[PDB]
Amino acid sequence: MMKIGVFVPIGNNGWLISTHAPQYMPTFELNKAIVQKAEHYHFDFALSMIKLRGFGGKTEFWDHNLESFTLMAGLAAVTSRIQIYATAATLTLPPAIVARMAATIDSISGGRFGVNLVTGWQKPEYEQMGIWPGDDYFSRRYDYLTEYVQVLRDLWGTGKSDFKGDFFTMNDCRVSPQPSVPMKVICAGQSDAGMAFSARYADFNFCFGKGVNTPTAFAPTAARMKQAAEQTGRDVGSYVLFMVIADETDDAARAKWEHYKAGADEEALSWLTDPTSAVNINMGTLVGSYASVARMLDEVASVPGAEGVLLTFDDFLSGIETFGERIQPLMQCRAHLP
Numbered sequence: 312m313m314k315i316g317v318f319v320p321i322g323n324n325g326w327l328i329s330t331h332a333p334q335y336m337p338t339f340e341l342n343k344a345i346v347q348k349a350e351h352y353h354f355d356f357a358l359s360m361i362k363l364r365g366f367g368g369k370t371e372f373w374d375h376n377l378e379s380f381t382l383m384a385g386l387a388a389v390t391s392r393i394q395i396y397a398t399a400a401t402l403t404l405p406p407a408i409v410a411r412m413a414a415t416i417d418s419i420s421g422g423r424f425g426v427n428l429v430t431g432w433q434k435p436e437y438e439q440m441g442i443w444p445g446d447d448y449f450s451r452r453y454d455y456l457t458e459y460v461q462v463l464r465d466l467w468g469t470g471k472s473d474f475k476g477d478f479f480t481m482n483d484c485r486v487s488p489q490p491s492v493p494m495k496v497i498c499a500g501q502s503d504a505g506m507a508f509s510a511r512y513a514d515f516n517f518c519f520g521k522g523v524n525t526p527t528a529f530a531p532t533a534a535r536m537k538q539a540a541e542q543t544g545r546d547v548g549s550y551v552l553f554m555v556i557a558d559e560t561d562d563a564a565r566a567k568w569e570h571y572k573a574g575a576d577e578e579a580l581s582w583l584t585d586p587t588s589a590v591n592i593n594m595g596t597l598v599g600s601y602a603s604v605a606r607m608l609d610e611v612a613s614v615p616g617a618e619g620v621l622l623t624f625d626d627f628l629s630g631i632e633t634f635g636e637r638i639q640p641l642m643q644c645r646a647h648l649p
């Protein structure tokens with residue numbers, strides 16, 4: 312048994328950088344239709360990223376992005392079962408605001424909300440608004456996040472923080488109400504420091520799936536995450552990001568995938584700088600018939616450490632539909648559902 316989440320397209324064209332991919336703006340209403348459909352098929356959770364700058368090109372890839380906390384507050388108000396995670400880009404929001412936003416969406420969702428904390432990698436995302444802390448930051452970002460999360464822990468735990476460190480000073484800082492349920496914190500650290508951070512403070516860790524149709528290729532990463540979690544004695548499983556390109560037969564899925572790679576938007580792709588393709592940022596990709604994708608996802612579920620998968624689709628509305636109608640009923644690790 313394995314948890315499934317949907318990575319909601321808060322950015323235009325989702326995760327495909329291609330003139331042959333579906334072209335779409337991220338709107339509330341689309342994300343709404345996506346999450347209500349995921350929920351209908353008993354997806355366990357929905358997460359949006361935050362992305363403050365695009366990559367340009369013919370497709371203007373990720374030039375158009377909604378903001379994660381307000382989007383997930385809206386989706387919380389129109390759902391009732393699915394878990395909801397927003398991403399805080401920690402350089403952009405003071406911890407006490409994040410603490411109170413999380414409490415607010417706790418209230419909207421009736422205890423279904425959590426937070427994905429990220430340090431921020433993309434210097435231009437922060438440079439553009441004059442808030443990059445210098446090149447000190449690459450090396451020091453995990454100390455920063457350590458202080459940040461301590462402030463949140465105090466606020467969610469007791470309503471109050473006196474935390475004092477290098478980057479934050481609380482003087483009897485107050486946030487009430489406190490979340491109705493223990494606030495879940497997720498992290499996406501791949502590095503050593505990142506995994507050490509997650510081992511100490513996260514409920515689980517997002518990592519990248521690897522290769523095309525090589526479902527268990529990420530297994531070493533999940534092994535290191537599991538090793539990091541032994542060092543704190545805490546249960547911090549891996550959730551693995553894959554793109555699913557599924558169809559009636561393997562041939563048809565492969566034709567879609569090739570069709571996408573053909574239209575690659577090379578102009579957008581320069582700004583980012585059986586093989587994985589940059590057309591989906593070299594994402595772990597599963598391409599096949601419904602049954603073949605079911606089988607490969609079953610393999611992911613057997614990797615030590617792996618507690619779930621976070622899924623993108625080439626086409627979200629019909630991809631979630633076919634996943635739910637054709638893939639999920641064939642998956643051993645989902646036989647527990649209605």
Ligand SMILES: Cc1cc2nc3c(=O)[nH]c(=O)nc-3n(C[C@H](O)[C@H](O)[C@H](O)COP(=O)(O)O)c2cc1C
Binds near residue numbers: 499501517519
């Ligand atoms: C599921 C997933 C979601 C992510 N979401 C974001 C995001 O919203 N914003 C962002 O700047 N980075 C995001 N990242 C990038 C990660 O934080 C990245 O793995 C990390 O920066 C590299 O690991 P390190 O920080 O330990 O070096 C995401 C990564 C994964 C795997």
Ligand SMILES: O=c1cc[nH]c(=O)[nH]1
Binds near residue numbers: 360362
């Ligand atoms: O910043 C981001 C968001 C989604 N996927 C990535 O690889 N990076």
